[PDB]
C-alpha cells in the first residue's frame, strides 16, 4: 500500500488474537506497545527518546500481523505514549520511504 | 529516492546555510532540530515523546532543503538528541511509506 503523511500513519495490527492501532514509525529502532500481557519470558530493557528513558519489558520472536503482512520479532511493552511499529518489523514487511 | 530501513534513515538537510544530518521520522508530527540561533520571532512550546516533554522554540516559515527538495514550514528548536524531520515537512517533499 502507499501511505501519505498528511495524517499520522496509523494501521491495524493483530498481536495474537488482538487488534490494535499502531503508528508506522521510521524514527524508532524498536517496536513499543502500550502495557499489555504477552506470553513468554521477558527481560527488562531501557529505551529512550525525547524526554528521556523509560523501562520496558522485552519479548522475543513474537508474531505480529501488520495490515495483513506477517512479521516475527522483538516487541517491547511499557509506558509508551503510543503504540509504534519500529524499523525492526518495518523491514520485515518490506517497507520503504520514497520521494 | 527509495530509502530502506535497515539503518536509521539519515539524510542531509540545508537550514539557513548550515548543512546537517536529520532523521526522517514518520513518527514525528513536527520537525525538531538541535539547538541553533535562527533569526526571527519564536513562541515557546512543549513537545512530548517517549521519556516525557521538553520545551522548544517554534519558528515558522523556515526554509529547509531535504536531499535537494525545497520545503518551508515550522521548525522547533530545542535540546533534542538528534535532528528530526517530522511529517509537517515530509508531506512537502512528496515522501510516502510503501509496502
Amino acid at each position: 500500500p502507499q501511505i501519505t503523511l498528511w495524517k499520522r500513519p496509523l494501521v491495524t495490527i493483530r498481536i495474537g488474537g488482538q487488534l490494535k492501532e499502531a503508528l508506522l514509525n521510521t524514527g524508532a529502532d524498536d517496536t513499543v506497545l502500550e502495557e499489555m500481557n504477552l506470553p513468554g519470558k521477558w527481560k527488562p530493557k531501557m529505551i529512550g527518546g525525547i524526554g528521556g528513558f523509560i523501562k520496558v519489558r522485552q519479548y522475543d520472536q513474537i508474531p505480529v500481523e501488520i495490515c495483513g503482512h506477517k512479521a516475527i520479532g522483538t516487541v517491547l511493552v511499557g509506558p509508551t505514549p503510543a503504540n509504534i511499529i519500529g524499523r525492526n518489523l518495518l523491514t520485515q514487511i518490506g517497507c520503504t520511504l520514497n520521494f | 529516492p527509495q530509502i530502506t530501513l535497515w539503518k536509521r534513515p539519515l539524510v542531509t538537510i540545508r537550514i539557513g546555510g548550515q548543512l546537517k544530518e536529520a532523521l526522517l521520522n514518520t513518527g514525528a508530527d513536527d520537525t525538531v532540530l538541535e539547538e541553533m540561533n535562527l533569526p526571527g520571532k519564536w513562541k515557546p512550546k512543549m513537545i512530548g515523546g517517549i521519556g516525557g516533554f521538553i520545551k522548544v522554540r517554534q519558528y515558522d516559515q523556515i526554509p529547509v532543503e531535504i536531499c535537494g527538495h525545497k520545503a518551508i514550514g515550522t521548525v522547533l528548536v530545542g535540546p533534542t538528541p538528534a535532528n528530526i524531520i517530522g511529517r509537517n515537512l515530509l508531506t512537502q517533499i512528496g515522501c510516502t511509506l510503501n509496502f
Binding site: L23, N25, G27, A28, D29, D30, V32, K45, M46, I47, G48, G49, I50, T80, P81, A82, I84, G86 | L23, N25, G27, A28, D29, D30, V32, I47, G48, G49, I50, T80, P81, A82, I84, G86
Partner: peptide, 8 residues
Amino acid sequence: ARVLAEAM
C-alpha cells in the same frame, strides 16, 4: 504534538 523518536 508527538515526536516519537526512539532508540534502545
